[PDB]
Amino acid sequence: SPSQVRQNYHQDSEAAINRQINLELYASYVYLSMSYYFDRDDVALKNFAKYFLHQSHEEREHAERLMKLQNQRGGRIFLQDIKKPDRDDWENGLTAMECALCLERSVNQSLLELHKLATEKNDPHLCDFIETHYLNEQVEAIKELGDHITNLRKMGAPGSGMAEYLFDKHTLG
Amino acid sequence: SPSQVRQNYHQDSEAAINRQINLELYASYVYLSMSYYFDRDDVALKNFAKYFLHQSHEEREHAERLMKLQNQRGGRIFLQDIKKPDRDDWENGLTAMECALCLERSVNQSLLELHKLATEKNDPHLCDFIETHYLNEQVEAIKELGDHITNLRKMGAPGSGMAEYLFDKHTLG
Amino acid sequence: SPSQVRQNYHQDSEAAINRQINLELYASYVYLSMSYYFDRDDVALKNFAKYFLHQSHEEREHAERLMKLQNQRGGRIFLQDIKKPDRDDWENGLTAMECALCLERSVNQSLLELHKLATEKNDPHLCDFIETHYLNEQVEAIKELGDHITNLRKMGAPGSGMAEYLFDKHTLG
Amino acid sequence: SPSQVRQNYHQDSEAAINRQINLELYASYVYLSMSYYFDRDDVALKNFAKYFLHQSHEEREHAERLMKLQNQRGGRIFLQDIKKPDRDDWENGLTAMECALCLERSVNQSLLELHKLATEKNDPHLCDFIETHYLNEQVEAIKELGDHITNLRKMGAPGSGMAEYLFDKHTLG
Amino acid sequence: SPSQVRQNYHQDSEAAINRQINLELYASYVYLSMSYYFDRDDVALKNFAKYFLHQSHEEREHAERLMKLQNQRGGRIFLQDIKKPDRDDWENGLTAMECALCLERSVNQSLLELHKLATEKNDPHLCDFIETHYLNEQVEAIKELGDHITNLRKMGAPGSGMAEYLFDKHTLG
Amino acid sequence: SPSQVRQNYHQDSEAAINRQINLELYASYVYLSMSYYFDRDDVALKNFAKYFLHQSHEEREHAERLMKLQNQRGGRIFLQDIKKPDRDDWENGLTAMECALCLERSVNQSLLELHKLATEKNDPHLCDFIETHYLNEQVEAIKELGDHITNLRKMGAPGSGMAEYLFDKHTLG
Ligand SMILES: [Fe+3]
Ligand SMILES: [Fe+3]
Ligand SMILES: [Fe+3]
Ligand SMILES: [Fe+3]
Numbered sequence A, B, C, D, E, F: 001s002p003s004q005v006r007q008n009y010h011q012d013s014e015a016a017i018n019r020q021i022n023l024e025l026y027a028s029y030v031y032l033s034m035s036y037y038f039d040r041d042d043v044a045l046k047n048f049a050k051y052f053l054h055q056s057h058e059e060r061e062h063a064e065r066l067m068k069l070q071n072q073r074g075g076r077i078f079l080q081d082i083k084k085p086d087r088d089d090w091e092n093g094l095t096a097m098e099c100a101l102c103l104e105r106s107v108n109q110s111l112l113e114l115h116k117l118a119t120e121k122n123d124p125h126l127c128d129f130i131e132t133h134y135l136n137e138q139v140e141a142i143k144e145l146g147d148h149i150t151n152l153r154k155m156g157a158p159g160s161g162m163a164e165y166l167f168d169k170h171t172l173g
């Protein structure tokens, strides 16, 4: 039953990899929702839409990389239902940035739990994979989101639409 | 009397094409009026003037394409008087954008009526011509105008001239 | 309440566009499942994996284009849950090709129903959009899948793994 | 019995596609006859021969495209006898142009009937195919033939051979 | 009320500039009418159509330059109705050339009256503008039209259609 | 009645040239039938379709060259009805190759009879034309078809579809 390539790969690690795949695709779905929310005629923030579409594409790559890692170690991929994003209307740019920050913090927390599980199971390859491809990216993404939120708050968002317009033109542009 | 190239071309379709030609040229005239209104020394919005001059040139092309289609199908072009635009002073940028949105919606409504007439008369070539060259352009133009109006409203226009200046420099520039 | 860009866009058309978006993303999910099924060490068909990953990326683009069309016409995007693919193990290459053919036929049937609804609602722009971007692509994809299935059956698949190997190397390679 | 790719493709549409294929090849045969009639030593109009040979090649492509469409939709091609052109001697350039105009009008009428049948059978892909690849081409070809006939009549053809010589050298050259 | 840039600009000069703008656009409309008259299948003179379309585009530029001059001097543009051309059928090439000559002579006469008014009002900038951008162009256009009419008369137009065909091919081509 | 260029050109030679033209076009029609038979979804042999389409184009050129030769020698072209191919379903690749071999042998036999007639009528130009443009081509085509048939038989065709697939990919590809 076990694959000819499976070595030092625990069942719990495989299940955690599958759950992380589902999370990464949920995050991609949420970012797509934000991106096409900012493409609305009553919102009209092109650079916000570009930023969130790029985030969605990145998360899909993260998930595809996770699926490739699952296949490499001899595990079996079990896809689940990709849940809808918790919101349909994202209010404005600052709220979308804060929701994206909350997402990334959750993805990073899940990745930290996965690394802790791999360390407990003595899987050095999985730990190195998580450290190389997912940890520093999460901290850079969280730092970037925090910078964006700080700039939006200081410019006067969300009360002033001039602030969101100028942030769209200068920072994200 | 009928031309050697006229085939499956109804009289009502020819009359509707002539009326659409007159509308497209009226729209070009209105856009020219807006463009050279924004060139005034007491207005001084160069990018608004460029945008509306480009819209005027586009509408002329639309009309010239309509005249070419009329000649291709064996119909006869009957030009009418190009009426003056309903306004001489366009108040400000937001009002001009809203008036342009109203125009385009009317041109699109006229184009939809023309397509409905062509479908009722079983003229597939005319329907395909309208769909290919005029429908998607109208929806893109209307979407762009809606985005511009939303951005202008959110920036604080027309109350704040800083908003119109920054929209001129960043969006239309 | 209605957007400033909404014109000749029916509620039923908006709902059908949302359902088509959900279908296109389900199809992308299914193609991703097939692609990373063929990346398994006990399957090892690299070109099948490439083909299905490309199909998944294409379907996402189809969905993103549908979302853009929804935003252009003044409709509102309502995302739903992306259901898991009906299978986790795809047996072999021929079975995967047949399942992909069944999917595409369903997507084409849904697109034909959407076009019929748009024609009944007299929405020429939506009909032209569906015809230009989705109908001929569906027929080309279905034709390609039928060719692949015929070649696989004639080569001796799925009984002979030599047939699947040679089809992977020569056709999909 | 039905092909694995056949979907929303009616039998009447398949028969009409076969008849259109036969017509397109008959038109190609007629154009070839005209072209090699103008290559005679007692006619000696090289540019007329080039024009009609190009028309023949175009019609063959039209037929080959029709055959490809028939194969794409799951229909079966049934070739018939290609009838000889109704004339062996084409009198002169103006008569050949008028006969070519009559042909094209017939091909366009057949294409319009085919589009009407496809619309009645609710085959949007076939309607879009006919509109995209065959309707506007027919109207451009008919317009070009009408222009050529008008120029030939005004120059003094067919009474004056100087007119046909100058039309061959300047227009078709 | 007067603009901050208005200096040595008389009200009569502003009114004459507005009337000249309306004339230049009427001339552009007339040239467009001629150009798309020569695109008819029963006329079929491509180079005449090109010539008159170029004349129409030039006259629009003349009008746009006049509007720019009006804005530069502090005057206010007041657009009027663009009257339809006096003819729908232009008979033939020679008649169209003669009508174009009559137009240009009228535009030049209006420009000469405008220059006389500016000289009487002691507006050296307006006089220099008219001399630099409009007088020599009118005399060159009138000379070219006279040459075309002389050539058409000598070749045998409008009685001989061979003359119009050869003039279209050689002179305007 | 005879043309000014007719010299040493017999009536029987002219009739044989016309019959050869009709045969060459029938062969082109048959090759087109085979090519678009192999484009079917239940056949799916792209390289067979390419090969037979190229053969059809070549035969048309052969016929056009024959028509040009007929015009050069002062003969008159008399086109006949192009008969439908004897088959609609070509079974498989080997059967199509064998039918193509039978055709070419017939075309070569007809060409040999035409050369014999020209030699009997003492027409050295016609004999040289047939030898230069048609004899060696027939023997090369027959040799190529024999090689293809031998390879198909040795690979196991038509019983093994793997043989036809590999021949399509390697030989015709
Ligand atoms: Fe990620
Ligand atoms: Fe327009
Ligand atoms: Fe798709
Ligand atoms: Fe054709």
Ligand SMILES: [Fe+3]
Residues within 6 Å of the ligand: E024, E058, E059, E062, E107
């Ligand atoms: Fe002028």
Ligand SMILES: [Fe+3]
Residues within 6 Å of the ligand: F024, F058, F059, F062, F107
């Ligand atoms: Fe041949």
